Amino acid sequence: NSLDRAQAAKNKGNKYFKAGKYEQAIQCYTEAISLCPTEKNVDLSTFYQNRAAAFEQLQKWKEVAQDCTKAVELNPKYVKALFRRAKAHEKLDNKKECLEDVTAVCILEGFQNQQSMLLADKVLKLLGKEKAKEKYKNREPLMPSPQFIKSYFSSFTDDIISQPMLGYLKAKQYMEEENYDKIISECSKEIDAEGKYMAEALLLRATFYLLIGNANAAKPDLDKVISLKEANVKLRANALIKRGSMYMQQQQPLLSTQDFNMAADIDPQNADVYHHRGQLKILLDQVEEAVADFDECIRLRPESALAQAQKCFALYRQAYTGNNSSQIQAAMKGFEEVIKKFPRCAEGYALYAQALTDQQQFGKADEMYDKCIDLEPDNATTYVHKGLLQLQWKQDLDRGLELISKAIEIDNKCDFAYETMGTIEVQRGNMEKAIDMFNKAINLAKSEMEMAHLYSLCDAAHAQTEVAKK
Amino acid sequence: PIILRLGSPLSLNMARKTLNSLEDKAFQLTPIAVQM
């Protein structure tokens, strides 16, 4: 009965444990370690894990990881020992080791334990945020394509800075000639000389700071345009739109809405404010606030195809969230009415295809994406949409890779496509090629938040290969 | 976690939420996750 003597020592250590006498419980567990036959892996791993619990209440995290480690050697799939070591590594700032332990925990649990997944999600965000910060320091900025720049400014009508010409004047001519890399220089000459186009150059320089991914240099310019009350209200409203979007990009919903609300108050008929705020309201699932902004866009732009396509999709999300099939079909038929009234609005088809995919009509959604290729053949994002469709629809990873690769041929500076290709290589099991695609998107991401998400995908991939080695 | 992309249409920003969901399932549907 040599094993009964080990459990007897373990059971008295449990009574010291419940009385708060952890040092005396540790000695009983140590006595149980000695009396357990080496042939009994499970019982011996139990005794090590119990002693790690006593070390945990004393908050001696080093001894916790040590005892959990020995317990895993006897019971390699001891989920309680692996998870306790993951918590121990978190306290010791062993984030990579904590991620690897909690990765094995989630796999053994079938991803069914919210407690384990919250810990993995917590350490993944921290690891990705750290690397995104250090990489964003000395990252060289890339100027996006002219097609992206013109599409960005075409989403504004009241910005002034994009208007044609009838320091800053030289910057406006470099812009009309698509020589964007020298716009920031000529704008600084106005600000340094404090000319009459000072607020415009301050706003135009901040815009291209954002366009090259330098949100840290755009913030002081946006702050300054907003502080100048004498400046044109159109320039302050446009600067508040861009500072609010940057706030939302940095996970600041409250400051974002404050800037958008102030933009609407100081410039009540600026349709850019209602257009860009409503798009954020949809992303935040604040639907009734979105239709209100999109209804104002229609009121201010009664002939705009996109404005009615927006509101039609906003009405759909309202029916989708309330789950009335009568209202859902009402808004679904509204899409077919929008595409007939505006047959060359590609976003009308894309918003419809999203609603079709949300409601399982994949074949018709692929047709709407095909129509976008007819109208706009050089739009790479539509091929990303078709690729994402092939994953949700048929799980055809080969055809999905070909469509995502097609978007790269059109726009090799599309970080969204590289992220989708790495996601596919994870699903196929090619972890090294997946990290390869994630890194190419990192060097292309436009914000630090996007870069942190991509770095998290890398650490999750690397952690799985380490778990695979055992 | 709203990952907002600069200068993108609404349909593209909607696809980010779809990509996030597909990334979660991709890591749960890897050879190492099923063989353990």
Residue numbers in the entry:
A (entry chain C): 109 to 274, 297 to 600
B (entry chain B): 43 to 78
Study authors write:
Orf9b is a unique accessory protein of SARS-CoV-2 and SARS-CoV. It is implicated in immune evasion by targeting mitochondria, where it associates with the versatile adapter TOM70. TOM70 is a multifunctional protein anchored to the mitochondrial outer membrane. It is a surface receptor of the translocase of the outer membrane (TOM) complex, the gateway of protein import in mitochondria.
We determined the crystal structure of the hTOM70 ΔN2/SARS-CoV-2 orf9b complex to 2.2 Å. One copy of TOM70 and one copy of orf9b are present in the asymmetric unit, consistent with our stoichiometry assessment. While the majority of hTOM70 residues were visible in our final structure, we found a central portion of SARS-CoV-2 orf9b (residues 43-78) was bound to hTOM70, but the remnant of orf9b was disordered. The visible portion of SARS-CoV-2 orf9b adopts a helical conformation: The N-terminal region of the fragment folds into a “U-turn” shaped loop that is followed by a long, slightly bent helix and a short helix; the C-terminal region of the fragment extends towards the proximity of hTOM70 NTD. This is in stark contrast to the β-sheet-rich conformation adopted by the same fragment in the orf9b homodimer. Using PISA software, we calculated the buried interface area between hTOM70 and SARS-CoV-2 orf9b of ~2000 Å2 and the solvation free energy gain (ΔiG) of −33.8 kcal/M. Owing to the high resolution of this structure, we were able to identify extensive interactions between the two proteins: (1) Polar contacts include 12 potential hydrogen bonds and 7 potential salt bridges, involving 10 residues of hTOM70 (from α13, α19, α21, α23, and α25 helices) and 11 residues of SARS-CoV-2 orf9b. Of note, multiple salt bridges (distance 2.7–3.3 Å) were identified between E549, H583 of hTOM70, and R58, E65 of orf9b, suggesting their importance in the interaction. (2) We identified 23 non-polar residues on the surface of the CTD pocket interacting with SARS-CoV-2 orf9b. Comparing the structure of hTOM70/orf9b complex and the unliganded structures indicates that the binding of orf9b induces evident conformational changes, which includes movement of the bridging helix outward or downward compared with the corresponding helix in yeast TOM70 or TOM71 structure, and the bottom helix is pressed down by the N-terminal portion of the orf9b. Collectively, we identified a highly flexible region of the CTD-pocket of hTOM70 associated with orf9b binding. By occupying the CTD pocket, the orf9b may lock the conformation of hTOM70 into a rigid state.
